[PDB]
Amino acid sequence: GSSGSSGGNLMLSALGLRLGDRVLLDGQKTGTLRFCGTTEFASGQWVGVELDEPEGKNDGSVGGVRYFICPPKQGLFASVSKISKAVDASGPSSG
């Protein structure tokens, strides 16, 4: 079906990514995208990513705001600027 609109699909849309897909955290770790847009506890632009490996800090829940229900410590929030598009690393290259 391909759906899921909550509010804040202007950032990812401009970058070229969607929800559900995975990304490269710090060019090392890997997580699954879930949230994308603004935040309540903070300001600016942020995104919710779920840590694949058995690691994390928050359970995708901050105060009175819910982003996703993940196992014991399996959710980390960070700025899109500090994230890279994982999967498929074959294409444009020069140096």
UniProtKB/Swiss-Prot annotation:
In which compartments does the protein localize? Cell membrane; Cytoplasm; Golgi apparatus, Golgi stack
Q: How is it modified after translation?
A: Palmitoylation by ZDHHC17 regulates association with the plasma membrane.
Question: Which residue intervals define the domain CAP-Gly in the entry?
Answer: 37-79
Name the domain of life. Answer: Eukaryota
> Any idea what job this protein has?
Functions as a cytoplasmic linker protein. Involved in TGN-endosome dynamics. May modulate the cellular compartmentalization of AKT kinase family and promote its cell membrane localization, thereby playing a role in glucose transport in adipocytes.
> What does the domain comment read?
Microtubule association is inhibited by the ANK repeats and the Golgi localization region (GoLD).
- Add the further remark from the entry: The N-terminal half is dispensable for proper Golgi targeting, whereas the GoLD region is required.
On assembly, the entry states:
Homodimer. Interacts with AKT1 and AKT2; when AKT1 and AKT2 are phosphorylated and activated, affinity is higher for AKT2. Interacts with ZDHHC13 (via ANK repeats). Interacts with ZDHHC17 (via ANK repeats).
Name this protein carries in UniProt = CAP-Gly domain-containing linker protein 3
User: What gene does this protein come from?
Assistant: CLIP3
